[PDB]
Every structure is written in structure tokens, then in C-alpha cells.
Design an enzyme around this catalytic site. Structure first.
Site, mmCIF file in Angstrom:
data_model
loop_
_atom_site.group_PDB
_atom_site.id
_atom_site.type_symbol
_atom_site.label_atom_id
_atom_site.label_comp_id
_atom_site.label_asym_id
_atom_site.label_seq_id
_atom_site.Cartn_x
_atom_site.Cartn_y
_atom_site.Cartn_z
ATOM 1 N N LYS A 161 -1.618 9.314 69.215
ATOM 2 C CA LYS A 161 -2.644 10.049 68.780
ATOM 3 C C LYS A 161 -3.641 10.206 67.581
ATOM 4 N N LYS A 213 1.562 5.360 57.414
ATOM 5 C CA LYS A 213 0.975 5.771 58.307
ATOM 6 C C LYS A 213 -0.407 6.239 58.454
ATOM 7 C CE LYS A 213 2.257 9.888 61.493
ATOM 8 N NZ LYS A 213 3.421 10.603 61.886
ATOM 9 N N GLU A 264 9.523 4.775 55.647
ATOM 10 C CA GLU A 264 10.497 3.807 55.971
ATOM 11 C C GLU A 264 10.152 3.149 56.953
ATOM 12 O OE1 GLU A 264 14.406 5.561 56.469
ATOM 13 O OE2 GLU A 264 15.235 3.460 56.877
ATOM 14 N N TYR A 265 10.333 1.783 56.780
ATOM 15 C CA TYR A 265 10.431 0.508 57.898
ATOM 16 C C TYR A 265 11.451 0.695 58.398
ATOM 17 C CZ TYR A 265 9.856 -4.368 59.961
ATOM 18 O OH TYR A 265 9.812 -5.159 60.689
ATOM 19 N N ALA A 266 11.450 0.409 60.064
ATOM 20 C CA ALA A 266 12.285 0.339 60.871
ATOM 21 C C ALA A 266 12.121 -1.070 62.073
ATOM 22 C CB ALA A 266 13.005 1.480 61.700
ATOM 23 N N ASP A 317 9.586 17.667 68.950
ATOM 24 C CA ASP A 317 9.279 16.219 69.414
ATOM 25 C C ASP A 317 9.719 15.521 69.492
ATOM 26 O OD1 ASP A 317 6.633 15.801 70.898
ATOM 27 O OD2 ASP A 317 6.358 14.646 68.797
ATOM 28 N N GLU A 371 9.422 7.660 72.118
ATOM 29 C CA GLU A 371 8.843 6.708 70.828
ATOM 30 C C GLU A 371 8.286 7.074 69.729
ATOM 31 O OE1 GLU A 371 5.509 8.423 73.069
ATOM 32 O OE2 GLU A 371 4.770 9.329 71.973
ATOM 33 N N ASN A 372 9.529 8.385 68.961
ATOM 34 C CA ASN A 372 9.855 9.190 68.021
ATOM 35 C C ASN A 372 10.807 9.097 67.731
ATOM 36 O OD1 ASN A 372 6.882 9.928 67.892
ATOM 37 N ND2 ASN A 372 8.049 12.397 68.417
ATOM 38 N N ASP A 392 8.749 10.920 62.936
ATOM 39 C CA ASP A 392 7.630 11.924 63.596
ATOM 40 C C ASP A 392 7.376 13.226 63.318
ATOM 41 O OD1 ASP A 392 5.399 12.723 64.027
ATOM 42 O OD2 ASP A 392 4.843 11.759 66.004
HETATM 43 N N1 LIG Z 1 8.736 3.562 60.194
HETATM 44 C C1 LIG Z 1 8.378 2.571 61.246
HETATM 45 N N2 LIG Z 1 8.610 1.325 60.985
HETATM 46 C C2 LIG Z 1 8.425 0.578 62.629
HETATM 47 N N3 LIG Z 1 7.447 1.448 63.461
HETATM 48 C C3 LIG Z 1 7.017 2.674 63.256
HETATM 49 C C4 LIG Z 1 6.803 3.600 62.049
HETATM 50 N N4 LIG Z 1 5.930 4.934 61.619
HETATM 51 C C5 LIG Z 1 5.874 4.541 63.255
HETATM 52 N N5 LIG Z 1 5.765 3.384 63.770
HETATM 53 C C6 LIG Z 1 5.210 3.579 65.026
HETATM 54 O O1 LIG Z 1 3.902 4.118 64.477
HETATM 55 C C7 LIG Z 1 4.279 4.497 66.749
HETATM 56 C C8 LIG Z 1 3.372 6.183 65.843
HETATM 57 O O2 LIG Z 1 4.292 6.556 65.296
HETATM 58 P P1 LIG Z 1 4.006 8.459 64.698
HETATM 59 O O3 LIG Z 1 4.960 8.232 63.342
HETATM 60 O O4 LIG Z 1 4.997 7.971 65.915
HETATM 61 O O5 LIG Z 1 2.668 8.991 65.040
HETATM 62 P P2 LIG Z 1 1.630 10.068 66.060
HETATM 63 O O6 LIG Z 1 2.582 10.928 65.563
HETATM 64 O O7 LIG Z 1 0.532 9.921 65.623
HETATM 65 O O8 LIG Z 1 2.223 9.482 67.424
HETATM 66 C C9 LIG Z 1 5.343 4.889 66.740
HETATM 67 O O9 LIG Z 1 6.381 5.293 68.187
HETATM 68 C C10 LIG Z 1 6.688 3.243 66.496
HETATM 69 O O10 LIG Z 1 5.732 2.882 67.617
HETATM 70 CL CL LIG Z 2 4.111 17.781 72.256
HETATM 71 MG MG LIG Z 3 2.494 12.855 65.172
HETATM 72 MG MG LIG Z 4 4.861 10.001 67.601
#
Ligand SMILES: Nc1ncnc2c1ncn2[C@@H]1O[C@H](COP(=O)(O)OP(=O)(O)O)[C@@H](O)[C@H]1O
Ligand SMILES: [Cl-]
Ligand SMILES: [Mg+2]
Ligand SMILES: [Mg+2]
Ligand SMILES: Oc1ccc(Sc2ccc(O)cc2)cc1
Ligand SMILES: [Cl-]
Ligand SMILES: [Cl-]
Length: 268
Positions: free
Chosen positions: A19, A38, A87-89, A132, A136-137, A150
Site C-alpha cells: 500500500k 523500501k 536485508e534482501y530475501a 500483521d 505476503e509479509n 513488515d
Molecule cells: N527484503 C525484501 N526482500 C525481497 N522482497 C521483499 C522484501 N521486502 C519486501 N519485499 C516484497 O515487497 C512487498 C511489500 O513489502 P512490505 O515491506 O510488506 O510493504 P508494505 O508495508 O507496503 O506492505 C512484499 O510483500 C514482498 O513481495
Molecule cells: Cl490490518
Molecule cells: Mg507496511
Molecule cells: Mg506488507
């Protein structure tokens, strides 16, 4: 300590969107270190009034150190944007993996639940609630290990809620959607929702409308397909209790006979 700026990084492929977050692969120029940046827009943060959430995300996540929790290394900002250095995943989200396979077998599921519980046990020892947890997190390391990410909704227990709910109700407990006081037991409910979704392919209170989802959650209305085994049913039913104080301790999850029989990773 640095002192980071945008000029210090070479930006690469988009890793995902949320978002607020727009997340990119990036390489730091002097060291060649690969990481994830991010990116958030200040105008969107201010209009939504969620500055305090971002500060929590940074302060809380940066001080946590656990193998099953994503590192946050630091942050910086300019006139229009804020940047979090993560950190990159490299193996992506549990969300994507579930889309690929439709359902997880009992071994994969029990192993993810073990890793999740280990991570949450560490968070709760600092009285940190995540609030949360959802596919996706949950990110995956180079060895396929789960890392919670997240921390934008994380807090210290006990808590009320002061910010509007934007998206899905699907992982929230009755005390959260009803806007009541809550504590660390919220993460135990979410763990139960995840265990069901991993095994079945969809979350247990899912529905076509907000209004009916709210009803299914507050009344705890869920049922099992025939293929879900007795052991899985026992664990899921213990986690999805309306009364939070009746939900089990994380030690009880880690030592559950279905978990110990099927997980490929140990308890920590
Ligand atoms: N450190 C990371 N390594 C790889 N992919 C990531 C990483 N952080 C986020 N992503 C991808 O980006 C998306 C959004 O990141 P997130 O931190 O959850 O943002 P938001 O706070 O907007 O939900 C994740 O659901 C994932 O698909
Ligand atoms: Cl929520
Ligand atoms: Mg967030
Ligand atoms: Mg998220
Ligand atoms: O509107 C904004 C813009 C940037 C930030 S970054 C940050 C600030 C303080 C702090 O203690 C931790 C991180 C936060 C809110
Ligand atoms: Cl990938
Ligand atoms: Cl109940």
C-alpha cells in the site's frame, strides 16, 4: 555511523509493492553489498497520517536480532521520499509459493509454523506484538527458511488501536476487528489462520464481503475439508479460540505432537 543517501546505491529490479512500500533490489556502490530498498512517499504518509507507524517499524525492527526475522539496517530520506534499508530475501514470499502450489503438505506446513513460532517467541519476550502476520509479509532466505517482515503495524502490549484498518480482515482476531483492548495473544490467532490457509489453500473465515467476513470471525465460524488430519485439526482448533486467554502459549505450539512429528526444523 553513515549517513546514507540515494546517491550511494544502484537501483535494480522491482521486488514488490504494498500500500505504501515500493521495494527494489539495490547494490551499495563502495562495498557492492546487495540489499532491498523500501521506498515510501512523504505525501502519501502525511495524507494518511501514518508517520508514527513508520517510526515504530524502524525503531522496533532495527533492534530485533533473530534468524527468522528480517533485518532492518537503517534509513534515510529526501524532499519527497523515505528509504528503509532491508536485508534482501532471495526466495520471495510465502504468498507466491502458495499461489504456485495451491496447498502445502504437512511437512512444509509444520516446518513453517515452527519457524514462525520461534520468531514470535523472541518478539513476545520483548513484549513486541507484530499484528500483521500473513503470507505476503513472510519472506524466504537463501536456504528456504522463513523470515517475518513488515513491522509497520507492530507495537508494545497491551494496546488499543488508533489507526484505520485499510485492507483484509482475514487474519485479525475478534478483539481486534471489534476495536477492543488486545495483547500478544493476537499473534497466536493469526498463527492459527496461517496453519489452516497453508493446508487448505484459503483462510478459514474468507468471504465475499467485509460485513460477512466480520460475522464469520466474531462468531468463529470455520469448518474443515475431509483431508485435514486429526492432528492438524487439534492444533488449529486450540489457536482459533474467541477468548484470547484460552489460546496456547508458543511453547505449547512448538511441542504439539503434530508439529514435532512433521516439522523438519527444531525448536528455540
Ligand atoms: N527484503 C525484501 N526482500 C525481497 N522482497 C521483499 C522484501 N521486502 C519486501 N519485499 C516484497 O515487497 C512487498 C511489500 O513489502 P512490505 O515491506 O510488506 O510493504 P508494505 O508495508 O507496503 O506492505 C512484499 O510483500 C514482498 O513481495
Ligand atoms: Cl490490518
Ligand atoms: Mg507496511
Ligand atoms: Mg506488507
Ligand atoms: O514522516 C516520517 C518520515 C521519515 C521517518 S524515518 C524515522 C524517523 C524517526 C525515527 O525514530 C525513526 C525513523 C519517519 C516518519
Ligand atoms: Cl524469486
Ligand atoms: Cl471459542
Amino acid at each position: 555511523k553513515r549517513q546514507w543517501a540515494l546517491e550511494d546505491f544502484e537501483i535494480g529490479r522491482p521486488l514488490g509493492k504494498g500500500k505504501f512500500g515500493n521495494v527494489y533490489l539495490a547494490r551499495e556502490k563502495q562495498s557492492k553489498f546487495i540489499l532491498a530498498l523500501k521506498v515510501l512517499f512523504k505525501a502519501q504518509l502525511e495524507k494518511a497520517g501514518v508517520e508514527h507507524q513508520l517510526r515504530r517499524e524502524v525503531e522496533i525492527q532495527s533492534h530485533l536480532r533473530h534468524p527468522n526475522i528480517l533485518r532492518l539496517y537503517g534509513y534515510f530520506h529526501d524532499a519527497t521520499r523515505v528509504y528503509l534499508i532491508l536485508e534482501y530475501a532471495p526466495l520471495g514470499t510465502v504468498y507466491r509459493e502458495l499461489q504456485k502450489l495451491s496447498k502445502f503438505d504437512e511437512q512444509r506446513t509444520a516446518t513453517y509454523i515452527t519457524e514462525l513460532a520461534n520468531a514470535l517467541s523472541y518478539c513476545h519476550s520483548k513484549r513486541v506484538i507484530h499484528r500483521d502476520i500473513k503470507p505476503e509479509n513472510l519472506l524466504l532466505g537463501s536456504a528456504g527458511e522463513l523470515k517475518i517482515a513488515d513491522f509497520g503495524w507492530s507495537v508494545h502490549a497491551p494496546s488499543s488501536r488508533r489507526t484505520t484498518l485499510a485492507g483484509t480482515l482475514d487474519y485479525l482476531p475478534p478483539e481486534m476487528i471489534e476495536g477492543r483492548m488486545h495483547d500478544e495473544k493476537v499473534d497466536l490467532w493469526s498463527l492459527g489462520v496461517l496453519c489452516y490457509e497453508f493446508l487448505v489453500g484459503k483462510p478459514p473465515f474468507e468471504a465475499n464481503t467485509y460485513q460477512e467476513t466480520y460475522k464469520r470471525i466474531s462468531r468463529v465460524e470455520f469448518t474443515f475439508p475431509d483431508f485435514v488430519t486429526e492432528g492438524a485439526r487439534d492444533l488449529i482448533s486450540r489457536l482459533l479460540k474467541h477468548n484470547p486467554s484460552q489460546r496456547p502459549m508458543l511453547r505449547e505450539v512448538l511441542e504439539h505432537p503434530w508439529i514435532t512429528a512433521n516439522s523438519s526444523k527444531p525448536s528455540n
